[PDB]
Amino acid sequence: MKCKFCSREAYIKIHYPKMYLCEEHFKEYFERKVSRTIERYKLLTKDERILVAVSGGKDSAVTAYVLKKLGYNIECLHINLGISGYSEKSEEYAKKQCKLIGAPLHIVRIKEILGYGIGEVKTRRPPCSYCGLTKRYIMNKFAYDNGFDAIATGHNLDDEASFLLNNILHWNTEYLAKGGPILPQQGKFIKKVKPLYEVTEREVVAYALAVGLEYIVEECPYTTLDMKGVLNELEEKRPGTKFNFVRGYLKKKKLFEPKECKICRMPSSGDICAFCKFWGLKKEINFKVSSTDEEPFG
């Protein structure tokens, strides 16, 4: 097959709208779509200082890559989970990505600041579950401490769809109230946006490979995959299913709609916050930085 817009060999078939595209015209389509998403939902403006949490996975990598190419002011943060025999390679993937992207990369090593790696704490709570708590907290407090205006994550259409299906099966109506491409700044919660909201996981894979981004497959090696497979099954039966599901969700989201921590002063239900209680912290963590390990002199 040949590209819709030139004589080059097709690199990928895009379903909506229907067109075969070569590598370069696919890149352009992908970048335009992401730009369209930012515009439609008013996610970002070019004056904002944006932080991208880069796990070394494809999604956050492509996010930082495209925001950069689009001309946004982005810096990246990699949160090293402290798993011996795992996290070192992950951090290396994130570093290589940011070098390629040309974004400053800040690193927080959980094991260094908290004393323990993910999967080393004496608790029966699943490693990846307190991992999620810990990571979200650090992303936000780092963004906050350093005066960032926004955090962009790499959640794509397939992520939103699978998260939606999962939370509906479990009737997690609280989670269901808080979906969509944007969580507006609210107190010490920094604005969080999802620029890849409307691109598919398949398009993300294709984009990374097109621009020479290399990535790891699994951030925490300790369901979503079940949901994605189910949704992929349904999608092949009835193309348009995933998109239709999310669109419907955005319209009905409203139906799910019905302090400061004594340690770190970040938002807290209860007087001491979840992060602080779990980690047994008596003192605040200061994530303020004046430079990166890679550019110590500015």
From 32, 89, 99, 170, residue interacting with a second copy (rule: CB under 8 A): 170
C-alpha pair distances (Å), 145 with each of 3, 31, 106, 184? 47, 30, 13, 18
Instruction: Assign residue 147 a region (left: φ > 0; alpha: ψ between -120 and 50; beta: otherwise).
Output: left
User: At residue 276, what are phi and psi to the nearest 5 degrees?
Assistant: -60, -40
Number of alpha carbons in the 13 Å side-chain half-sphere of residue 226: 5
- The site partner of 234 among a second copy, Zn ion, none (C-beta below 5 to 8 Å per kind) is a second copy
- The site partner of 113 among a second copy, Zn ion, none (C-beta below 5 to 8 Å per kind) is none
3-state secondary structure of 175: helix
Annotated binding-site residue? 76:
no
C-alpha pair distances (Å), 155 with each of 72, 168, 175, 254, 273? 18, 18, 15, 21, 26
Contact region with a second copy (CB under 8 A), list: 81-89, 108-116, 255-263, 281-289: 255-263
- The site partner of 22 among Zn ion, a second copy, none (C-beta below 5 to 8 Å per kind) is Zn ion
Q: What secondary structure does DSSP assign to 193-232, as a single string?
A: E-TTTTS-HHHHHHHHHHHT---BS-S----HHHHHHHHH
Residues 144-163 that bind a second copy (CB under 8 A): none
Residues 256-295 that bind a second copy (CB under 8 A): 256, 258
Closest by CA position to 242, among listed 181, 200, 180: 200
Contact 113, 145 (CB under 8 A): no
Number of alpha carbons in the 13 Å side-chain half-sphere of residue 202: 10
Annotated binding-site residue? 135:
yes
- The site partner of 249 among Zn ion, a second copy, none (C-beta below 5 to 8 Å per kind) is a second copy
- The site partner of 248 among a second copy, Zn ion, none (C-beta below 5 to 8 Å per kind) is a second copy
Annotated binding-site residue? 261:
yes
**Contact between 27 and Zn ion per CB under 5 A:** no
User: Minimum distance from CB of 180 to a second copy (Å)?
Assistant: 14
Distance of alpha carbon 11 from alpha carbon 13, whole angstroms: 7
From 45, 129, 224, 244, residue interacting with a second copy (rule: CB under 8 A): 244
Going by the annotation, the residues of the binding site are 3, 6, 22, 25, 53, 79, 128, 131, 135, 154, 220, 261, 264, 273, 276
Contacting positions for a second copy (CB under 8 A): 168-171, 173, 226, 230, 233-234, 237-238, 241, 244-245, 248-249, 251-252, 255-256, 258
Q: Which residues contribute to the site for Zn ion (CB under 5 A)?
A: 3, 5-6, 8, 22, 25, 261, 263-264, 273, 276
